[PDB]
Design a protein around this ligand. Sequence first.
Ligand code: GTP
Ligand code: GDP
Ligand code: GDP
Lengths: 52, 428, 428, 433, 28, 196, 45, 47
Amino acid sequence: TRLETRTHRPNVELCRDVAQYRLIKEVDEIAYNVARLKETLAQAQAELKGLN
Amino acid sequence: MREIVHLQAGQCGNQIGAKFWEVISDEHGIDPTGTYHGDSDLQLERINVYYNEATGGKYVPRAVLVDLEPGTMDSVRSGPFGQIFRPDNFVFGQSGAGNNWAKGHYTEGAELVDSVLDVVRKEAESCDCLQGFQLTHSLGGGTGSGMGTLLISKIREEYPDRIMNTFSVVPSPKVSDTVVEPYNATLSVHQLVENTDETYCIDNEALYDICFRTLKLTTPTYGDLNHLVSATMSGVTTCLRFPGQLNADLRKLAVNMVPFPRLHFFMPGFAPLTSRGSQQYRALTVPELTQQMFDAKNMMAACDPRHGRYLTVAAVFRGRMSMKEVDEQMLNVQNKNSSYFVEWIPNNVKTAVCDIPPRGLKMSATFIGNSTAIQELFKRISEQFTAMFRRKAFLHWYTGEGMDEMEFTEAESNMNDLGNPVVTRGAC
Amino acid sequence: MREIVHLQAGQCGNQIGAKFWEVISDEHGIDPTGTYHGDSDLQLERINVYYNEATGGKYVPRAVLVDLEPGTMDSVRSGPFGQIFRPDNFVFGQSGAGNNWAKGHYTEGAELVDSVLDVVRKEAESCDCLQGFQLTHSLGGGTGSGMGTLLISKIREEYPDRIMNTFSVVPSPKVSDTVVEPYNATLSVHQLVENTDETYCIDNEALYDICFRTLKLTTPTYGDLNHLVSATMSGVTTCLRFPGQLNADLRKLAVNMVPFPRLHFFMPGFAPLTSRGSQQYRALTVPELTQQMFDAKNMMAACDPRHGRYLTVAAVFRGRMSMKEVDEQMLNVQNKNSSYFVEWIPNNVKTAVCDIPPRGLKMSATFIGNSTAIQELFKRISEQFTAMFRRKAFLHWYTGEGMDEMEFTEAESNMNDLGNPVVTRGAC
Amino acid sequence: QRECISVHVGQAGVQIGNACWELYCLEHGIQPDGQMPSDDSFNTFFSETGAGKHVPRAVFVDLEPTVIDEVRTGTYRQLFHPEQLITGKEDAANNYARGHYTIGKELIDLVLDRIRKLADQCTGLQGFLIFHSFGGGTGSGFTSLLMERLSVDYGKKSKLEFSIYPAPQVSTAVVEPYNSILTTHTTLEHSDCAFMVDNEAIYDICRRNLDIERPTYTNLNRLISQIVSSITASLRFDGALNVDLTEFQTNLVPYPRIHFPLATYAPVISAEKAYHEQLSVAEITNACFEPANQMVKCDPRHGKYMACCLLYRGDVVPKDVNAAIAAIKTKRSIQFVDWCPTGFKVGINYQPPTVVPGDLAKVQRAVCMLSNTTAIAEAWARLDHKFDLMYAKRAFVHWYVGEGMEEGEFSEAREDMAALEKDYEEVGMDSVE
Amino acid sequence: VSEGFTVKAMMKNSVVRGPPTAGAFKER
Amino acid sequence: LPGNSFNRNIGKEKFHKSQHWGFCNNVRMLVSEDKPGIGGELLLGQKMKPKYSVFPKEMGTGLPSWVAFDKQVLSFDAYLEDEVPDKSQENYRIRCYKIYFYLEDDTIQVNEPALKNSGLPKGIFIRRHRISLPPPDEDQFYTVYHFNINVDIVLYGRTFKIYDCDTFTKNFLKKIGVKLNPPGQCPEDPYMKTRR
Amino acid sequence: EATEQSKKAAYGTNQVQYDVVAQMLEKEQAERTRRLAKKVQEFRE
Amino acid sequence: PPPKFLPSEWHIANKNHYHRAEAQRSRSERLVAESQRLVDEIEKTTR
Ligand SMILES: Nc1nc2c(ncn2[C@@H]2O[C@H](COP(=O)(O)OP(=O)(O)OP(=O)(O)O)[C@@H](O)[C@H]2O)c(=O)[nH]1
Ligand SMILES: Nc1nc2c(ncn2[C@@H]2O[C@H](COP(=O)(O)OP(=O)(O)O)[C@@H](O)[C@H]2O)c(=O)[nH]1
Ligand SMILES: Nc1nc2c(ncn2[C@@H]2O[C@H](COP(=O)(O)OP(=O)(O)O)[C@@H](O)[C@H]2O)c(=O)[nH]1
């Protein structure tokens, strides 16, 4: 939502500031961490099958 | 509007057409259920060239599936894109060809051909302005040879001015699957001479060579061989399926590639072909596509083009690309290899370009070649036929189902009759 | 736009060029996957000398890998920069050289050289302006001695006006890694004399003596030795990849350093080399850089330059340096060592500087030397060769593979003939 | 693409081979049965079936049940293909002749058929590693018949042979002298590079180094196995300077006939002792030249070297070697024939030597040398004298002349062998010109 | 000399082999 | 930064070499693409390991899947819907299907069972082949773990709703360790209701 | 001239940094080898 | 009938069941600790 709001800046003010790349790396970092949760959840599910 | 009715004969034609319809459904955005889940409106812009409409906005192919045994219809239906055809179009008979051209032409095929022409008639009347028919069949063997020639004869009698595109699998010299392949090919090329408008000869040994030497696979199957058939089968007809600068439909290719009415046997080619490991390391451009088309290994027929002068050449490109580079490459090929092109046809290369490339690629280039080198194939079938026919083995089925020795003699004399003009055009 | 085709033969050539591609990918900014992650646009401006562009922006080296035994092919792939190479450029066979020049030149090398030449032509016509071929191989042993010389011969016959470079690891004076390496070195030098335009004679013990007396390592690796080779490999071809004042490419070095066509055997040298203790006792400037250049311990061949007068010296510096110091230092070396430079070639030293220093270093400089002192290597090879060829030992497996006595006779006569200019130029 | 069919002919061959496979199976992880527990390096000695059974590329062959009937009911009863082990019914009874001209013509066809099979199932044979035993029937006779046929059918293809050469003072059989001279008279033109080992020497080494004062035959085969793991290593593991089978010939066999390289391992220390040793690349190179670690009873200082092949394995920096080889080249007790300016074929595989739960200690570095020293002539001489001491009063000749061989051969043999004897002396002579 | 449509054909002064003759105007 | 002497040694004890360059069918390729480097380490690039099914120690005698896991298939029952003028009978069908999972090669099959006064295309619905996953992830295939009571399995754009398997599948999946869901009943087809 | 002095200063400091990095890493490899040897010794008891 | 087993196989089977249950529980507590680590690490780095 922050990036979608910052998209609507005017002509010159629409800039590549330090927080813009920080927000892009934030989105990529959250995707990476979420994927690591899904991998750990899949491992936990298969291990629950083994414990059963 | 221009539209084509798709006919499949025999197990080979049925599997080739099933792979073809998988490829066309993927290209035009149709799911295995039938519903359009696409990305661009150009897929729906010209979808009424192979797909009939419906209610519910999801489309049904205009394919008639002919076979003399009721198992390959079940296999095609059980396939992935198999429950997309018209169940009325599943025409089949409770009999067996037995790889007998006599049994595919003068018996039970001759009693199934009435229902075949009925469903063909219904599909052709449910149309606006027919371009023609395309039959997929194997030249050697039963069914698709005998049924193939019988349907082509009846359809050419019924519709005299519509195109006939027959993709025929010619028997290979190195390997074989039917004893009477010389008999069946010899008996079938005669009807393929005066009937079909474009016959494309595809050799299984050449498909072997392309799948192992260029594509460099380990375990290729008939699915992959029929896919190599289907890529060219779609690239020939992509110009009336998608927009493009300098388009060329089937007749605009046929006039430019058939200089004399019987010299319409072609060597097809597809050439953005790369091994899987080396796919990422490619620098795909128009000169590289031209190199791969004209190189004498991507031919899908077992006829080396260096053994005969090219009569006519067709190159149907796909993808956003510069026409100057295309003219560059065709002029350079003609200039550098001038003895392999005929001199009484100045600029014997026809060029077409389409805008939309196949999915997963950037530029495509399908190749059609009418050359002198088909004399090797036609003579090769003639000596195999004379070797099996001098002692008259495997002939009593044909004579008992109702043939005569002069029919086989006429067939071999007419393949020699077809071999002669290909020679006299290659030698001025 | 000048481009170079890289070629590597044998285990020694394969590992040297693998380290060379690692070093030059570090210099140009290419990751192991092939994408470009650089720092300045000067790396990408002339990246089209060693890297063919591809789709997706990944750059593929213009190198052909030749080895009769596909074991070092696996080693190169399993190394760090193994995914960067084209999978089609690995040309290998189902045989082994056995350290036999006969088995690398008159046998299965001949049935594999056609595929090598096809790959070479594919990498040479996908160009606009070719400059030269460079080959890395070992002078003593199989494959690289045999296939290296055969491939140089075939490429020189096909492309007669292009620079041919050969980085050859010569046999040692002290310890042999191949018993028949006098035979291999004689039979390879006989081809290398009347084929190539530049030859870099590199000795393992000389690279090693640089590795300890100058660098003060304790446990080197052959990876470190090929790094020392690759530094000179990159430093020779650096003005054609990076800007500067007084640029000099391969041919501009060749015209200056080859006075007569046979005397093109050079001694490479690369010497901003500071050790783990003496790096911080150092006052790095152009005069001491020239001192380490012209010191007779940074030679990469085991041949003492004080034993023979220099015919020609060239130095390709890299870095932002004033040229008064460079010009004055080379003049001072030529003046203060009068007995080591022949007087009939005034200012026999070529100076060429670039502006982009090797990553990490502020000011670097390569050194290439054609000297009278190359005669000792050929004389040691000749004397070991006549000591072995005298009693006809280790020769029955050359005659059995199909060579003759007269080929050894001609090679020995040619190399002893080559011993005559490289003593007459030292004796005026 | 690097495959090597290994033929073991004779009790020795099988017993020596049954000790090389324990190793090849641990050096590649392949379990006793043949199912790599839980990557493609095994394709030099083990084939992969659909089931996943890593099947060996060998043909254990003997003419008497016993020997092989223990590899078919041992801990490897499910690794070897039941048809790879080709046995017979009646042994050749220490009669080179019986196992070449009588009971040999009965198994040769089936043995050759399985080698044809094994070959096809390979994309690039590096050679046939044979394991005979100059002494008994098979080891003498069959090995000969194989060599001949395995030379026609499959040509050039290297045929490197490993032989248990007779001893200088021990010897088990009384007819040994005969068998040995006969097998050389018939396998001097159909071999390639015959490596050699004598039980007395390995026995001595096992007492002077491993401290085993009572060594058996298994304490011996295990070492012959680590020697082969060295020769065949650059084809399986990684290294700087590799060395394929085809190279151990064009570097060790000078003149055609002189194809009898000797063998010597380097760090044959034994646990406790290694605690006090640095086992450096020079402390193992020099050892390989020591006239005691030599695995064939022969002081090489009383002759002249012709070509050494040092194959190191483990932690061995490119320098250590160069420096060590140079130090050996400066020594006066290591002279080399004039016609060998260069006399070293070096190789450096990186895989550290493996450790079978047995004796030889776990080493971080090791070397195995192959020397064609001329001191092997004293051996051929002694052997010839014993053959002569008996062939005078035509001893044990009825036995051989009855099975089929023509007496003529007995003579012809010693005749040609004398030429080989002369050959050795000459290669040593220098030239004042 | 270049055989056919190979890479050796499209390189500067590359002479190309002609195709073989055929059975027309030839005795049988 | 890489200079002429800037390197490290390694303490590995594993130096296996994999034959990444070979021949099959007398042409030169990469043979495979999924073989590790030196010491069994995966190359930069390739990252795959399960691929096929990862079955537990049931029949873990070392025999492969095509021997120990012999002609034993897992059966399931499902249904679907669509509308295009050439039918079985009527709107809103619960067309019954029998799905088999063949264990010897990890494949699946969909088949048409029998209904009484019914003119369906009768027989095979999907041929035996290894069907991919619904594509967020169109590179993995269907293992045994993605099959259960009362679930939605997506095959070729068709959401088969599996409700009751059969006794052997219950026993086998109970052994493999997946908790089977409580069974459900297929809703009745309206024309089958009018016919019955 | 001051910028030039500064530039040379940067270059030299960076070179000395590289050298110290190398030396420390080597000290590490030295310890690593001793450990490997002592670990090998562990397998001999 | 099923084959009449031996007293040796009875103890071996019981011990192997014991070991399999214990090893599964050990790997299970390993994943419990790793799950706690992942959740805590990602919460802190997100903040
Ligand atoms: N490591 C090892 N070497 C063995 C073993 N058995 C025999 N040898 C060697 O084999 C030699 C004697 O065996 P052979 O000469 O091959 O006997 P043979 O060829 O089977 O002849 P027959 O007596 O007819 O059966 C001995 O001198 C040993 O060197 C063994 O079990 N282990
Ligand atoms: N391209 C392709 N060719 C096929 C396929 N299946 C069979 N063929 C070829 O078809 C040839 C014979 O088919 P044929 O006997 O005529 O089948 P029929 O028409 O049903 O009698 C064989 O030699 C096969 O090589 C396929 O799936 N794709
Ligand atoms: N600088 C350098 N030299 C090497 C390397 N590998 C091998 N050599 C040299 O190459 C020589 C042997 O190579 P050779 O047997 O001729 O290789 P072949 O061409 O495959 O026969 C040895 O004397 C080594 O000194 C390396 O990685 N770097």
